[PDB]
Amino acid sequence: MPPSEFLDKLMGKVSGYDARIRPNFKGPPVNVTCNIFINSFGSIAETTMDYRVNIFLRQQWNDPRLAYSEYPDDSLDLDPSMLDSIWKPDLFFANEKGANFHEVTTDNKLLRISKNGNVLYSIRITLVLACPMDLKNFPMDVQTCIMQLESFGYTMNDLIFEWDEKGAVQVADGLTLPQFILKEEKDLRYCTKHYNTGKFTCIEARFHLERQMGYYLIQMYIPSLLIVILSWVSFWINMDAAPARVGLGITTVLTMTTQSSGSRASLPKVSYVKAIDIWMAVCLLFVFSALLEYAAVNFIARQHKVEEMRKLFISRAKRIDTVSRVAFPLVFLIFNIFYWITYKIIRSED
Amino acid sequence: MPPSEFLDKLMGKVSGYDARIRPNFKGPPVNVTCNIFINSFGSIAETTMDYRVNIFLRQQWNDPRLAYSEYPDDSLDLDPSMLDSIWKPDLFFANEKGANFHEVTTDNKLLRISKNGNVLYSIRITLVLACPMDLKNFPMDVQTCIMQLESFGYTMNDLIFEWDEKGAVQVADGLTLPQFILKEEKDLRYCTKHYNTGKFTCIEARFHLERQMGYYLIQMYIPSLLIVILSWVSFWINMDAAPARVGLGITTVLTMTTQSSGSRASLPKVSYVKAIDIWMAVCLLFVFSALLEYAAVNFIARQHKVEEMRKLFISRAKRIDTVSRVAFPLVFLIFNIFYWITYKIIRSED
Amino acid sequence: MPPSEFLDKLMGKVSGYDARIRPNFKGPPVNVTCNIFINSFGSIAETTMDYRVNIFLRQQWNDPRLAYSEYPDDSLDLDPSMLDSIWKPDLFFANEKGANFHEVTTDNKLLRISKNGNVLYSIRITLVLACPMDLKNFPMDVQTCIMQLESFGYTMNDLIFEWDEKGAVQVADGLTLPQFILKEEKDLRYCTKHYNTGKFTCIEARFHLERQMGYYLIQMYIPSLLIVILSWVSFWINMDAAPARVGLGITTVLTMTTQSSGSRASLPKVSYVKAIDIWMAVCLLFVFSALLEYAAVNFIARQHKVEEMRKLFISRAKRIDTVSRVAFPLVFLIFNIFYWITYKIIRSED
Amino acid sequence: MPPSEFLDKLMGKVSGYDARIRPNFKGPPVNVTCNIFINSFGSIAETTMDYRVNIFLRQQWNDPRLAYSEYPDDSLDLDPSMLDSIWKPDLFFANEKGANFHEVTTDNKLLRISKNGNVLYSIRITLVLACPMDLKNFPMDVQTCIMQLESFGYTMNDLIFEWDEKGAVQVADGLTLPQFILKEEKDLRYCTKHYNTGKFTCIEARFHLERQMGYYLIQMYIPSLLIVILSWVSFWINMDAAPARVGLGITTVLTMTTQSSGSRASLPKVSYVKAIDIWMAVCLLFVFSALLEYAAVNFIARQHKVEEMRKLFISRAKRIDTVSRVAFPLVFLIFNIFYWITYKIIRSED
Amino acid sequence: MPPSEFLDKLMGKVSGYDARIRPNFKGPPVNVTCNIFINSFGSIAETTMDYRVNIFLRQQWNDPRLAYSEYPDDSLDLDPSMLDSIWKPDLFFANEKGANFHEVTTDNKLLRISKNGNVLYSIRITLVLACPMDLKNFPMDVQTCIMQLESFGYTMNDLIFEWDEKGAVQVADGLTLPQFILKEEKDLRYCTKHYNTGKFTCIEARFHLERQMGYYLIQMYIPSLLIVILSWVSFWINMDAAPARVGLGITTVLTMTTQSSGSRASLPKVSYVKAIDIWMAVCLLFVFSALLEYAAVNFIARQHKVEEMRKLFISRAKRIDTVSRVAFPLVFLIFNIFYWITYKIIRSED
Numbered sequence A, B, C, D, E: 001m002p003p004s005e006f007l008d009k010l011m012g013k014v015s016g017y018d019a020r021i022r023p024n025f026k027g028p029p030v031n032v033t034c035n036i037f038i039n040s041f042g043s044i045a046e047t048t049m050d051y052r053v054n055i056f057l058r059q060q061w062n063d064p065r066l067a068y069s070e071y072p073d074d075s076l077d078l079d080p081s082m083l084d085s086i087w088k089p090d091l092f093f094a095n096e097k098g099a100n101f102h103e104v105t106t107d108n109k110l111l112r113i114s115k116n117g118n119v120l121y122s123i124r125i126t127l128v129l130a131c132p133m134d135l136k137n138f139p140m141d142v143q144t145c146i147m148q149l150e151s152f153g154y155t156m157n158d159l160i161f162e163w164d165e166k167g168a169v170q171v172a173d174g175l176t177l178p179q180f181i182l183k184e185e186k187d188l189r190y191c192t193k194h195y196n197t198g199k200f201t202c203i204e205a206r207f208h209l210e211r212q213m214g215y216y217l218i219q220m221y222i223p224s225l226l227i228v229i230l231s232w233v234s235f236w237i238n239m240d241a242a243p244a245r246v247g248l249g250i251t252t253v254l255t256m257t258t259q260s261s262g263s264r265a266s267l268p269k270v271s272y273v274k275a276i277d278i279w280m281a282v283c284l285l286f287v288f289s290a291l292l293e294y295a296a297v298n299f300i301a302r303q304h305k306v307e308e309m310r311k312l313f314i315s316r317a318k319r320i321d322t323v324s325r326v327a328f329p330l331v332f333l334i335f336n337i338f339y340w341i342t343y344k345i346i347r348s349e350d
């Protein structure tokens, strides 16, 4: 038998196969299993509120027609150039921007057909998908990003979408993200869609992302701690009143302010207050306190600037110094560890 | 009856249905009801003067042809591949940039037809639409953005566009905007269009947006208040003449100026003066006053630098200090609350 | 009579209408009237040297064919789907980048035909057009932007382009630009094109744009004036030699320099010197003078630092102070008003 | 004779003209003359390493077929809608990115045919072309940008490309570039291409660009000179040891550093050292020297701070001052003029 | 024999050549040799994690059909307009974004056919390819970028891809990269692909890139060294306690911090610590030490500020100075050379 003759008999003019009619017309809904392979992941930006993903969609369904039973083999790998004639289920993504195809040299498509009629359709598509991330806790946070596959034009009575029991989602080996660590959980559940026009099927896939704090710690926490320690020692040995003494505080003020402004750049605008803002606010309070104590001791010195009074004022000023000395490391220590442990337990609960 | 035979009889060669002729030719204008569903909203930028929206257009009209009365069911869900043969009303948007279609796997289209001839056309389109926002009051403002649907090629005698009496505009559940809060009002009115060529139908939909001031307050108001308070206390204990005393003022000057420059970055250029500019101007006036009073007390000290004269100059200088002390918090307090209450009442009127 | 039968008789196979032949072949040139409507304007950027415009092109010409005289009405509104068969005049823009079409739901096109043969073609196109603006005077300037319509493929003997006597250019009501004010003058003149291949027709439309200086004044002139006044008073009460006195000058130097650098950011690079540069240069000269006078009085004090000599040096130093006092406001006043009046008269002449 | 009948006889089914066969098959190579007109030029960016150009390609060749000799006129201006049937020579650009066509209203194309068979093909194309500029001397430099036209698919035995003897390259009148001045030289030479597959024809066009230094001088040279002069005078009158004296140097240090960082922004990264870097380095050396001399005189003063020794130390310190005084202007003068004259002669040689 | 008649006999209707069937059907897999020519390279950005490349793909395979043996010559250069009829092997790239074709004037394609049936297919394509660079050592690093060619739709039994024994990869003469130096090694190995659907052939090409450190050294190392030396000398002659002395340290602090922030701008965010960070950290430690020693000597002076005690405190303070003097150059010298030699040996091993 020649291949061409059979090939036109299967889906051509002698065949009564109209490509505008669903298989099993006036019958039970056509069940469709969907298997997705993630070729690549990444390019997630906080401002844009979306990520980039390259998938290999694969969907299988059954047809009562296109059952040959004439060649001795089980399956046939057909050309992807008559895919227009074969009926194709509609499938679009709800949180989707763009989503072009790939056409390098030839269109990237795959067609297979078995003896019973089970087909295999494979399409490569790069999707920009919108993820509504919540930045309540900026340095440490778990982000859930949603992929939705749903039927635009058919009701419940047709095109029921089902997941695959085994190996529903696969990932490429040695695939890494610079910023996040992917979690191998990938919980799958499906939520149907209700509209005034009708009720439409949908299936959902969920991915969990964990950020890496190493960059954040080196970029912000480590310099800020250095500034705090520097300020502490600078006043600790500072003596009486000198214009030079003021310089140590002045440098810290400006540098801390610039760092604070710099940190709130990449992130988009949100009403709620992030954790990094809290850390910046407390460090600003500490540096603001530094000036305060100086003003205080200067006021005591001003009152001092008779012999009977001098001893008490000089003593009171020194008392202010030693009390500042013991107080400043202690309250920062009891606060930062409290901050870290409370964030440590919230991530553990999440 | 086979589905294919009926399907070609309805809109094919045996049918006298020419797709270039409007239904009810030489007759009353074809009425069209339009229902819009907002799939997603967002990506509004002040500079660009436009926003991004993903809608689900739905338009219904009646045809005297395409009335089958042969299958026992009421409606038929047809394929979206013969939509070219069906006559389609022209519809374009006036404040429109771009507005591509979506073609993921298959074109996103929907076709339905009832027994009487009422059709249902559904198209997914992402529109970039221009909104002429007025920034007279920057931190608090209500913005109205306009969507216009109008007929490019037909006159009044044809293609009259009407709204839908019930559920004209729907919104997706759990849809949020990072910057703005959408108001559930959505007032609908229609304005016809007049041209030299003729008079063309149009319908309009209006959306109200309310900005969230939480980001603005934390970003700008809170640091500026801190700078003002710091400056106040800094001079409050400042004593006589020392080069060190000057430092407190110097830091504030530069930091305030940098913040003022930084704030006017995101916004585009406009002739009128924004509220934030007013707040920045008054704070700059306060810090400018700080230097002034110093210069004054230094001039009194310069005159002082004989015994009879010294008491009066020293007293006058101290008088200047205490008067500065009582005056500075009081006038800022009576001004900021006045500013807030006047803006509070203008938003209430708006 | 059926509409379809007439519709194919007019421009089909029974008709000898070849769409590759110009009307009035071997005859006088085909005159074409062009009417343009500006749907929207804006998005002008100085660096890119171009603007964005959305027009409604409309062109009318006569054909000896397509004269029906069979239906009792005067005109017919045809579908825009047989516009390919109708002969269309070539028309392109010389200072053009891009210029895509609009295809939302359906192509935006319009076809009309009268009894005599006068047709009406309407096309919506968004054009990015290059405007060679001259920035000799930056804050105040009038910019002329050119739109050119010309025939790519035909000579003088064919396709003569003429303007419309009445209402050649219309503008949408309530159309505004954030930066510029449009002038309702719109002078129209036409310049033919000469090439080695031949002579080609062209028509030109000119628009005048006037910038709004309110943003510029608030952004730059008002802070710079404040810095100048501050500097003036700061030295005015400055006494003898103190390291603190220097601070007043130091702050001004840096802030003025940063503002000067900031101002020359948006503008692209040009050889000639802008007006804003002149204003920045004079203010820099004033602040530079401030340091000078200080150095001078310090040199007199250094010579002073015997009793007979002290009186003359102290007097000379005070003389320098009072002379500085009277001189500094006077020369700035006689210069700034001179600057403003000369620019006021140049705009009036322009 | 009707135009349509002749028009289909020339390139249709009765004609044996196959559009897949080169003219003069099994014969001498088809010679092609190429004339280029530069409609616009500009948009050159140093980082991207490419420029934007809008050309009017024009190529002429001879065909033995398509020789009519039946109409009494010499040439015919055909429609650009049967250009697909006419055989067209392949032509692509080697240093090419993008290069789309223009389709405003109608495709921009031109067809002409003479009695002998000489055709004229005109195509409008905007090309982004890569120019490998060498930035050895940044402020003054001559840049050569290359345009290459070559045959992708044919060997030497076919499609020989020749230039045009007269008026090979034309430029539009009144065409200017904001940054560069075009030179009216435009030397043309051709270099053939060798590959493993075969030898392919190519022709090359060269353009020379001269930068304008006016922006660079005002932006960088003039402020830097002002800073140098200021520093010079500031120390020149500086007296003994005062903390205030230090301020004059401190301001210069920071401002010079910021300017130095600012200048190296637009330019991309290169291994070799630019001229502007040299100028920045020498000015940094001068300001660095300023601090040095201060440290020296302070060390002499420190040793001074017995009567016999005081006279010699005070004298030595004053000697250091006067020597600094004479030395500093002289060495800057003998260096800057040397720098300018050596660059003046290198541009003259180039 | 006419060329047209043979041309349609080879791949037309009289020929039984179906373009949907692979050559050697039901036979051994079709071997394909692939030769790639790199027309241009460059535009590599660290953030995007990808590079731009313009290649000339060339693939050869054998067909049992299309064996003419009728013209006396060996090969024929066909038109690229019947390339659709010829069967073409599928080929796509795995680490691929975009990859459009080039269509300037005509499509860039090449067709050749020999007497035996060996064909030659040439396609020009610009590919954006993702390179997973590792920035463990930023200033000096070798980067490997991967190109993968693989068969989308066929299994092992068909379309085996083989490399070319001689001249597999060629590069254009005089091709340079501004940032990197290409290594003439280009090791080629192939790795097959395993999927649930089946096993698919692939081949890989590897390129090695070496960065040039000249820009980095001038941009960062040279200024930082200057700051370190300046700081060293500044304290080296600094005397006792003066507010002026503090200035030398203050300037360094701010400038070093700004440089440190500036350096970490171009690079994207990564968890691990780069070499440049280490160098910045050590320089920050040195400048931080500068303040420390000052505080120490000031504390000794404070204790000093009775005659018996004064000699020991003054001596101890001077001892601190001389010890600082000998210590500071020595430890920087023993550290920087150690840093350079360890990086020198790691690059040599790599």
Ligand SMILES: *[C@@H]1O[C@H](CO)[C@@H](O)[C@H](O)[C@H]1NC(C)=O
Residues within 6 Å of the ligand: A024, A028, A029, A030, A031, A160
């Ligand atoms: C799809 O599956 C459901 C439940 O398993 C079944 O009731 C229905 O008949 C199936 N439809 C088919 C096989 O077309």
Ligand SMILES: *[C@@H]1O[C@H](CO)[C@@H](O)[C@H](O)[C@H]1NC(C)=O
Residues within 6 Å of the ligand: B024, B028, B029, B030, B031, B160
């Ligand atoms: C549309 O509605 C108007 C007013 O209800 C009516 O006069 C007109 O006949 C309608 N046109 C139709 C039904 O085609």
Ligand SMILES: *[C@@H]1O[C@H](CO)[C@@H](O)[C@H](O)[C@H]1NC(C)=O
Residues within 6 Å of the ligand: C024, C028, C029, C030, C031, C160
């Ligand atoms: C166009 O107008 C000119 C001048 O009015 C006239 O000479 C010419 O015949 C006209 N061409 C037509 C009507 O085709």
Ligand SMILES: *[C@@H]1O[C@H](CO)[C@@H](O)[C@H](O)[C@H]1NC(C)=O
Residues within 6 Å of the ligand: D024, D028, D029, D030, D031, D160
């Ligand atoms: C092209 O020119 C060359 C040299 O002038 C000549 O030998 C060749 O025959 C020409 N080819 C033609 C006219 O086809």
Ligand SMILES: *[C@@H]1O[C@H](CO)[C@@H](O)[C@H](O)[C@H]1NC(C)=O
Residues within 6 Å of the ligand: E024, E028, E029, E030, E031, E160
């Ligand atoms: C391809 O090469 C392999 C090994 O050289 C060989 O076994 C196979 O038959 C070849 N396939 C062909 C020539 O189609």
